[PDB]
Design a protein around this ligand. Structure first.
Ligand SMILES: Nc1ncnc2c1ncn2[C@@H]1O[C@H](COP(=O)(O)OP(=O)(O)OC[C@H]2O[C@H](O)[C@H](O)[C@@H]2O)[C@@H](O)[C@H]1O
Ligand SMILES: Nc1ncnc2c1ncn2[C@@H]1O[C@H](COP(=O)(O)OP(=O)(O)OC[C@H]2O[C@H](O)[C@H](O)[C@@H]2O)[C@@H](O)[C@H]1O
Ligand SMILES: Nc1ncnc2c1ncn2[C@@H]1O[C@H](COP(=O)(O)OP(=O)(O)OC[C@H]2O[C@H](O)[C@H](O)[C@@H]2O)[C@@H](O)[C@H]1O
Ligand SMILES: Nc1ncnc2c1ncn2[C@@H]1O[C@H](COP(=O)(O)OP(=O)(O)OC[C@H]2O[C@H](O)[C@H](O)[C@@H]2O)[C@@H](O)[C@H]1O
Lengths: 400, 80, 401, 390, 400
């Protein structure tokens, strides 16, 4: 259920390990699409169901003529959504060049529908997305405990925690604003908010505070947009909803470059994307520092770039990771029988290492977000040696 | 704490040495302004000395150097 | 019934925590109108009940014509005094501006009758207010114990305690003058006492080289202070004040013209000539903005906006600890769960649900009273037990246990 | 016309003195509505005049039935347009509480008109108020110089400059945003901004780019109070689309105890809390050792500010420089029996007998733009257009 | 013809300027397809002539059917050769996916000619490509001098020189293996070479107290990189590559494998091959965003859009300097002054007129060739300019 360095480990030693791992110089977390299921979010398996239920003729067009999707793969709900966007884009580009009119419209429709379905799954609150004080509801309860626990375990003179994520939704911002804490994400201004790469080198100081962190969104956001002038701006939820989100959701208008998000396999196709590169440079610079710890939760292990990066950080003899994977044994067995997908081979390769710096957790529902948060400890205020207390119980043990 | 306040004075230097009818003075630096309004920055002038009971009158003779330091030499002529 | 950071903790852990807190650099206490209930005072609920049964026609006029008090709140006793006073003041201001006559005189009588009830409840001893040695009675035992406990716990090189309050009575002044301690409250002189903001920075010293002292901040004024026409504030003694201007307020009617300065109003920023009020709150805000600070709150009802905002905003400092006492916590939780609750109850429920280990809340009914709060505070341990033979004592005892 | 305690001065000595003062630790600037006229602003007299000749049929009730305006002041264009709004709000609240349907409808029209004249004179760009990069234009050119030379002159280890203002427009915000520096105005957040009074004790640093502090003494256009008893701030576009548009382009409508400009709904305990903090911060700053103050554009129409200003002069380290254009025309009245209280106060400030106050007068010689020139001194478009050309 | 903001400056001032930019914190060089023409290479418009003179039958179908190239460009020899192979691979891939059997031969037959043409021009030695010690010949006399001059004028505590290129041949490797220098290029191993992107942050040091290494970024691939059956990129030696696949490409006339080769920027649609291309560009963009950089450009034709866009944006930093060699200013200035020429001419002439001191353009025909570039660079005082070792080696060989 819990493995370290290939061997098996027990619960008490795991708790003692987790406690002493939070005293190091660097602490960070990387969250995925599963960490927001308890708030109103969805996964990539539900998007395919929604697509195949709402649009029943485009599915037949995909299956019969172009042969992009097979029948059995669609029946079992085992078709990758990211790998289909790239193929559709390739077909559209080829058709456009040779001046074909009829075959150019269908792929436009497919891309518009597939982009619309992805957007709906990130609001988390439906039409209530435009209101205010959305962090006061009971759903955003464990995000607050996560931030409080992370931020209170910081001795003076150290560095603030860092958070990476691949969601488009505003869960962390809603949680932190209701709590009163500030996060730095590279933007500045109110009437004209712009992206500045050098805004990641700042910090607070007291004129005569101390509660803040950083936030990196690797695959873009739902309130970001580019006005084609090689600048990127950020606005509020209500302004974005009144500007473009509502038209996409309801008016079924054709999709354009309203907001920059990155669903797809190859992220290097876009050439003028200078935020993705900055985010990944800052991510790659974080894991090369000595005395670092990282906790991974909700990540499905299906991205080439990210797990390509993770493997290269195990050549440093001061790096530690803890990985939460619910369905570990099913991945364990399928590999011995011939192998599963590329997603399930990576975790099995990671587990079977021989370094006492990789820990993998499994166990179904005991490796969830709520289970994750409660494992983190609270600071000890007013520490004391307490030697005489153990002397007293070492009296009582013989008194037994 | 209460109303009573005592000190109100505005000088330009202090005596640092006596050598047999010859006086050395060091000029202030940290004062943002020596404004009170008269200022003496040149030989030939006259200066005064509060000795508690009487006033001693002198006459400036020299200036020189050696945040650096400035110095003045004077001679005494009478008292008031 | 004791929470810390949302979770629960028992009696012994609480006592060790309370012992640890009293060893820090700064310690202070904030008291409310419920702390002086065991001495002879009374709360606002009693003020409203005694008001409604003394001037029936004025209450009837308030309910019927001016529509300021609902017919239901009068019977269930939920009327708020401060908001009523402010509304009456606004009505008087507009009546003065539009030059109406009858309504202005009608409101003057109400505004005068309302202050008489407030003043009568702060005397604490009735007729013996104008007498001496009032702190020798047994009603002031726990005030003396609180003062003795606070001062004894300091170390050389540390600062003296501070006391903030919103009462008008003299219980805490009477108590100290029986111990011989000195309280600094910002006044000087005997034949003419005047207020000086500068002398909050004074301390004793011995010429051959009286070491006990403290400070007292009164946020809502006092029953002894009175302002003269020259825009200065003077202070007298209890006997002189009773003999010159609060024998005409009580026995005789319609005699209130700014005779003494208090703040029974909800909006205290409107008065643009009260600088004592702005002096006290500045010091209060300055105290809780320092490292290594502890604050104990007792008797407060959490119905004041400025204080709630100040307390909430100080919780982002990593060296601030509060302990809040609140008797009726269970009812507040129950009522908030149903989507209702008073504006005071949401504030106290919100504090209890925070995830920082720097907030502690105590409930329990009669276990969170004033006399119980004093008993929690520790006695100083002089001569920390020499040698380490207490370990041998514990062995000898516990091995046979 | 340069005076110093009844004396006279020439240009060069003043230009040296202002530099000498700027080498201090605590430096501050106080402004007024006089600095907004060079960008498209107005004054109290102008808006009062505009009000009189647009709504004359209801001017009588402000003098006959309710006694809000002095007839001499109305015919003299000297009324103060801040207390009128406050008293109108008090009257409307009392009427609404009394359930007087007949008299409740009277004051709503008056308030609707007054807010229309107030808002019309503060957009500074008309219908372009909601657009972006509005601080890039040539009109907002002089403001950038002030901030630049205030930041540059400060030595390492010095405190940041502080700025106080009576205006409630978005003028300095655009200048600072298009310069590329950050100002702390006391709010924080994006999807819900809230007022925290303790943010005034913050500062940046480099982990191995500057800032300044901005106080608004009378509110701003982008603040309001919603149903929940909390104060919010939005952008220019959001405010325009929410409430500002209807106020200018509708006949008759009123919301109530909503807006926080200018000094309006002081009768509530949630809105006065913000008003008090700015004033107490100014009072605490102005009473510190080794401070300076460069007053400009202020007509001395406030009783309370002068009381604080005079009292702080008891310390010898408090230096004041005033810029009062129409000085002699006040002296002439002062010699006569007539005058006004602001004129009496300013001439009393003239007739002092010490070298700490420095009054400056004249015509165009004492304007905001001239003051910008007195303070010391501290191709990208080609590359942008070349990149866009590709 | 030397300009600096529009003002002509003499030779000695230019030399004193070059001497001062070679002692900054960061120094770089960019080289194009004209820099290897003194070794046996060809330019881009010499390849089109050979193709259209050797295969006149496919040229009609490649213009009149699939609209892959214009008539004006193919008449004026202005074809972008490596931008056509990518589109051809896309066409072939889509045809293979949808199973159109008649269209596969028409693309498998032209991709076999494009490679047969571009491959042969990059060998530089014909049949001697598989032999050893190719760096001892006289064609590579100036590459050695460039590498030697770049390394010898660094002071302790300073970075290493960086070299970027768009050539995909082996000239620089052969030159550097003869001096004994080691060049990092992202690969490690001998019995299996593999691509490790994180080793661009590694450096050497001496255990006794050496500083002899540099970095090489190949933007368009190499002849010796290929993708085997598994999804990893390998590197081999020149002899091994020649015996594995190059011989059949040059000789056999119906040889096409599939998505196998990694030159020149071809199989970009695949998500494990575009990863290699993306890293080089990300690091190129990162290099020129530093406080004290100086970059020399030689052999480049300015016929690219992304590189021009990156270079223009890096000039809004007051401490970045550029030096440009272009042997055709005279024939471009007039064509722009009268009516306007091409995009390359427009770019270079817009750059020439800028009123900066940070740009310098050099022209004059043979006066701005690769060979002339080397002697403008300095030469250290203590660098040994003699020949003593070789005489001793000759005497040793003569012995016995
Ligand atoms: N309540 C839960 N708590 C924690 N984990 C959970 C929970 N429920 C499910 N999981 C696990 O959470 C995981 C969810 O798997 P996927 O939906 O593929 O998450 P992703 O973020 O990788 O997918 C996003 C893709 O798009 C992006 O652009 C990236 O490129 C991705 O390719 C599974 O392991 C679940 O068992
Ligand atoms: N013996 C006791 N010991 C401690 N607390 C007690 C006791 N008896 C009652 N309480 C609690 O005491 C608490 C407060 O009683 P209230 O009179 O409502 O407090 P306030 O909100 O008026 O606060 C006082 C001032 O606040 C305003 O600003 C005005 O200026 C007031 O004068 C209640 O919770 C009781 O349960
Ligand atoms: N172009 C100019 N340059 C310089 N000074 C000028 C200029 N134009 C006018 N002035 C001067 O600047 C003065 C500004 O006139 P007013 O608008 O009454 O002054 P305020 O806005 O500061 O007073 C309003 C505040 O005071 C009260 O408390 C109110 O409630 C507000 O809080 C003119 O009289 C000229 O002397
Ligand atoms: N001996 C010489 N020395 C120096 N320069 C020379 C010499 N001979 C010719 N030239 C010049 O060398 C230049 C030859 O330019 P070309 O080979 O067409 O351009 P590229 O190498 O960028 O082509 C590849 C790019 O194509 C895409 O754009 C991608 O971005 C690729 O990077 C001309 O200016 C000649 O005058």
């Amino acid at each position: 259920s819990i493995y370290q360095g290939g061997n098996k480990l027990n619960e008490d030693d795991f708790r003692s390990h987790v406690y002493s791992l939070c005293q190091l110089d660097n602490v960070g977390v990387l969250l995925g699409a599963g960490a927001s299921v308890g708030c109103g979010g969805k996964t990539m398996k539900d998007v395919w169901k929604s697509f195949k239920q709402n649009y029943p003729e485009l599915l037949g067009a995909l299956i019969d003529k172009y042969l992009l999707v097979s029948q059995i793969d669609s029946d079992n709900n085992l078709v990758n959504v990211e790998l289909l966007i790239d193929e559709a884009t390739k077909f559209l580009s080829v058709a456009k060049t040779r001046r074909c009119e009829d075959e150019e419209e269908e792929f436009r429709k497919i891309l518009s529908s597939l982009y619309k379905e992805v957007t709906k799954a990130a609001l988390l609150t439906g039409e209530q997305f435009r209101e205010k004080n959305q962090g006061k509801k009971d759903a955003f309860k464990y995000h607050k405990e996560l931030i409080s626990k992370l931020i209170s375990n910081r001795q003076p003179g150290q560095s603030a925690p860092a958070i990476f994520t691949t969601n488009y939704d505003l869960a962390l911002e809603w949680a932190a604003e209701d709590l009163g804490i500030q996060l730095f994400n590279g933007f500045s201004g109110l009437h004209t908010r712009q992206f500045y790469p050098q805004n990641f080198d700042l910090a607070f100081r007291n004129v005569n505070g101390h509660y803040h962190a950083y936030l990196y969104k690797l695959h873009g956001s739902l309130t970001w947009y580019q006005n084609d002038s090689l600048t990127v701006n950020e606005v509020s939820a209500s302004q974005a909803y009144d500007e473009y989100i509502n038209d996409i959701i309801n008016k079924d208008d054709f999709y354009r470059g309203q907001h920059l998000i990155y669903p797809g396999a190859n992220k290097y196709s876009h050439t003028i994307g200078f935020v993705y590169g900055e985010m990944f440079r800052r991510f790659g610079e974080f894991i090369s520092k000595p005395q670092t710890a990282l906790f991974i939760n909700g990540f499905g292990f299906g991205d080439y770039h990210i797990n390509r990066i993770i493997l290269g950080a195990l050549l440093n003899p001061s790096f530690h990771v803890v990985i939460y994977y619910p369905e570990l044994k099913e991945a364990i067995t399928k590999v011995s029988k011939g192998g599963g997908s590329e997603a399930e081979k990576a975790i099995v390769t990671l587990k079977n290492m021989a370094f006492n710096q990789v820990t993998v957790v499994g166990g179904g529902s005991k490796a969830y977000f709520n289970s994750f948060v409660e494992h983190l400890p609270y600071p000890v205020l007013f520490p004391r040696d307490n030697i005489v207390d153990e002397l007293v119980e070492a009296i009582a043990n013989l008194s037994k | 704490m209460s109303l009573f306040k005592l000190t109100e004075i505005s000088a330009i230097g202090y005596v640092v040495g006596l050598e047999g009818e010859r006086i050395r003075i060091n000029l202030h630096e940290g004062l943002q302004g020596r404004l009170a309004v008269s200022s003496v920055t040149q030989p030939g002038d006259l200066i005064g000395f509060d000795a508690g009971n009487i006033l001693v009158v002198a006459r400036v003779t020299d200036m020189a150097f050696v945040i650096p330091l400035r110095q003045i030499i004077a001679y005494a002529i009478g008292f008031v």
